[PDB]
Amino acid sequence: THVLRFGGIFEYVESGPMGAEELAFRFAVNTINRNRTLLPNTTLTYDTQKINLYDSFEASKKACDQLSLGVAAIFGPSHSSSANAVQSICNALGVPHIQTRWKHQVSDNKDSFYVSLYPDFSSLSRAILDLVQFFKWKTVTVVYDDSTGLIRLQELIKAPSRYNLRLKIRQLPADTKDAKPLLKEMKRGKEFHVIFDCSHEMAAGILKQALAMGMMTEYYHYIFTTLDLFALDVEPYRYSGVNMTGFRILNTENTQVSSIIEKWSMERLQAPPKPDSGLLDGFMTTDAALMYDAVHVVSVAVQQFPQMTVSSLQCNRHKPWRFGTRFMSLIKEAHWEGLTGRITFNKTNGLRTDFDLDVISLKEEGLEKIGTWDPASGLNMTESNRSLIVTTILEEPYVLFKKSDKPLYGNDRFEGYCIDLLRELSTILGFTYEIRLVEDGKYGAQDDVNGQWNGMVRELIDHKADLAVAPLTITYVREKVIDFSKPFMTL
């Protein structure tokens, strides 16, 4: 029947195997072909070209070859310089360029033949800040890997002048093994609240260093910028009590999406996994779920343009593709439920600025969902006969252990003036109670350096006790922090 060809350009170092992106591309095409609801009468074909990383010259040549073979779109390469070069070519010949990865948008750049399936930085930036504010952090250390990290967090970096966040900015070194000296400074600095802006492979690496450093405990809370957080081996850390929170755009809760991610692991996990990585083997990363979603969203557009056919275009000549303008318009208007949730582009710039994120945190069970985020709602986090606990302290003759012939259990082990008072109060006011001897053997004073209380006063402040029944002197400093009865003895 009817046939349409897509182009693919995938970046790599050394040689095979195939990478995640080129794999998801092929996988999406094979799947769609077999779907009888999507492109029923249409059968997708493709040319794939492999190039070196950062060789924009080679990327240009391969894109020109593909436009010569004839293609309806180029799922151009990932990295900034090659991607900008294929985008300029695609714009001159009016063939849609489909991107899956963020690159810096220059304002005065007029290219219009591209869409990008990657969740725009502006929106992610805001959702980081939204999360920080929900945890009520007033202090936070942002740690980034390379320059462009800065740009992904600009919304956050500019907050300290509107809201009340003091914030320290540090940079990782090239290698995470070099990161102890940096972590030691944060430790001395008491920087317990930390955002890591970096790849998920960097994050796996920096966590190991953080463990070594005594920094994976209940005292530390780490927010992760990476969307591939869910790919991290979390077995070394879930028992420790650290808090790890981040985001996930891969819609794993949907059953249809889980089954697709599985069939992927079978053809992929079948090939090289690593031991010392700290990543789960055969998890579908975001770079690849996006490519697979891009092939679908573009196909939804092809369904609405049966007239369209490929033309052999030459980079030599300034003659664009007849159907380009109309196809590009259909793609930008397209809507699709894919591996990464609602797909919808921005009328204005063709960037994916509106999308849905699950919000995930480390519980002892593993990484689990604790809410959602979307740009229009912010966070949607999904959150009398009692005995009184009486704190007291041994002090003659107020509270002592009773000497008795009879067996004594529980509260009846104690006697004294304060015990007699407690018994009367419990009868008059009608409560039951449990007597507990205070853990530090103190009445209650405030530390002159850190301002923390101890003794029975601290038990009350922290609501660990209901009552302190003891010869607790009523003083100015104490009455400011607890509520005393009127005195039962004056002296």
Site residues for ligand LY5 per CB under 6 A = 395, 443, 471-473
Give which of 200, 216, 220 is closest to 208, Cα–Cα.
Answer: 216
Regarding 169 and contact with a copy of itself (CB under 8 A), the answer is yes
Pick from 47, 65, 111, 374: which binds a copy of itself (CB under 8 A)?
111
- DSSP one-letter string for 36-71: SSSSSSEEEEEEEEEEETT-HHHHHHHHHHHHHH--
Choose among 378, 116, 368, 130: nearest CA to 252. Answer: 368
Alpha carbon distance 443, 32 (integer Å):
73
Nearer to a copy of itself, 289 or 313 (CB): 313
DSSP secondary-structure letter at 218?
T
Residue 31's nearest CA partner among 260, 297, 277, 248 is 260
For residue 361, with 0-12 CB atoms within 10 Å meaning exposed, 13-18 middle and 19 or more buried, which class applies? middle
In the numeric block, which tokens belong to residue 304? 């609405």
Residue with smaller CB distance to ligand LY5, 126 or 436 = 436
- By CB under 8 A, residue 107 contacts a copy of itself: yes
Could you say which residues in the range 438-467 bind a copy of itself, by CB under 8 A?
A: none
| Options 148-156, 224-232, 238-246, 435-443: segment touching a copy of itself (CB under 8 A) | 148-156
**How many whole angstroms separate alpha carbon 272 and alpha carbon 283?**
12
Nearer to ligand LY5, 320 or 471 (CB): 471
Helices (H), 164-279: 180-188, 200-212, 255-268
Q: Which does 109 bind (CB under 5 to 8 A by kind): ligand LY5, a copy of itself, none?
A: a copy of itself
What does 66 interact with, of ligand LY5, a copy of itself, none (CB < 5 to 8 A by kind)? none
**Stretch binding a copy of itself (CB under 8 A), from 42-50, 164-172, 348-356, 394-402:** 164-172
Rg of the chain taking only CA atoms, in angstroms: 32
Q: Residue 55 interacts with a copy of itself (CB under 8 A)?
A: yes
Q: For residue 448, what are its two tokens?
A: 């002159």
Distance of CA 385 to the CA centre of its chain: 43
Applying CB under 8 A, which of residues 14, 108, 448, 483 lies at the interface with a copy of itself? 108
Quote the least distance from Cβ 190 to a copy of itself, whole Å.
12
CB 90, min distance to a copy of itself, A:
9
85 binds a copy of itself, rule: CB under 8 A: yes
DSSP state, residue 321? -
The smaller minimum CB distance to a copy of itself, of residues 182 and 460, is found at: 182
How far is the CA of 434 from the CAs of 3, 103, 413, 422, in angstroms? Answer: 81, 64, 12, 11
Question: Does the footprint of a copy of itself cover residue 299 (CB under 8 A)?
Answer: no
Give the three-class secondary structure for 339.
coil
The C-alpha torsion from 75 through 78 and 80 to 82, rounded to 10°, is -60
Other Cβ atoms closer than 10 A to 401: 12
Stretch of 155-163, 339-347, 389-397, 414-422 contacting a copy of itself, by CB under 8 A: 155-163
170 binds a copy of itself (CB under 8 A): yes
Question: In angstroms, rounded to a whole number, what is the distance separating the alpha carbons of residues 427 and 271?
Answer: 74
166 binds a copy of itself (CB under 8 A): yes
Give me 315's structure tokens: 């980079």
How many whole angstroms separate alpha carbon 345 and alpha carbon 300?
A: 14
Q: Which one, 54 or 431, has the nearer CB to a copy of itself?
A: 54
How many CB atoms neighbour CB 155 within 10 A? 17
> Contacting a copy of itself (CB under 8 A), which of 92, 234, 279, 408?
92
88 binds, among a copy of itself, ligand LY5, none (CB under 5 to 8 A by kind): a copy of itself
Strand ranges inside 92-156, DSSP E: 97-99, 114-119, 139-144
Near a copy of itself by CB under 8 A, which window of 57-65, 69-77, 366-374, 390-398? 57-65
Which one of ligand LY5, a copy of itself, none is in contact with 147 (Cβ closer than 5 to 8 A by kind)?
a copy of itself
Print the binding letters for residues 176-215 with a copy of itself: x by CB under 8 A, - otherwise: ---------x---x--------------------------
**Is 109 among the residues that bind a copy of itself (CB under 8 A)?**
yes
Least CB distance to ligand LY5 at residue 416 (A): 12
**Does 366 engage in binding with a copy of itself (CB under 8 A)?**
no
What burial letters (b/e) apply to 190-202, b meaning 16+ CB within 10 Å?
A: ebbbbbbbbebbb
- Based on CB atoms, which residue is closest to ligand LY5, 269 or 400? 400
Q: Is 260 an interacting residue with respect to a copy of itself (CB under 8 A)?
A: no
* Residue 151 in the binding site for a copy of itself (CB under 8 A): yes
- Specify which residues 6 forms β-bridges with: 46
Q: Which does 265 bind (CB under 5 to 8 A by kind): a copy of itself, ligand LY5, none?
A: none
Q: Which of 1, 41, 161, 382 binds a copy of itself (CB under 8 A)?
A: 161
Q: Least distance (Å) from ligand LY5 to the CB of residue 472?
A: 5
Question: Which residues contact a copy of itself (rule: CB under 8 A)?
Answer: 53-58, 60, 80-81, 84-85, 88-89, 91-92, 104, 106-111, 141, 146-148, 150-151, 154, 157-158, 160-161, 166, 168-171, 174, 185, 189
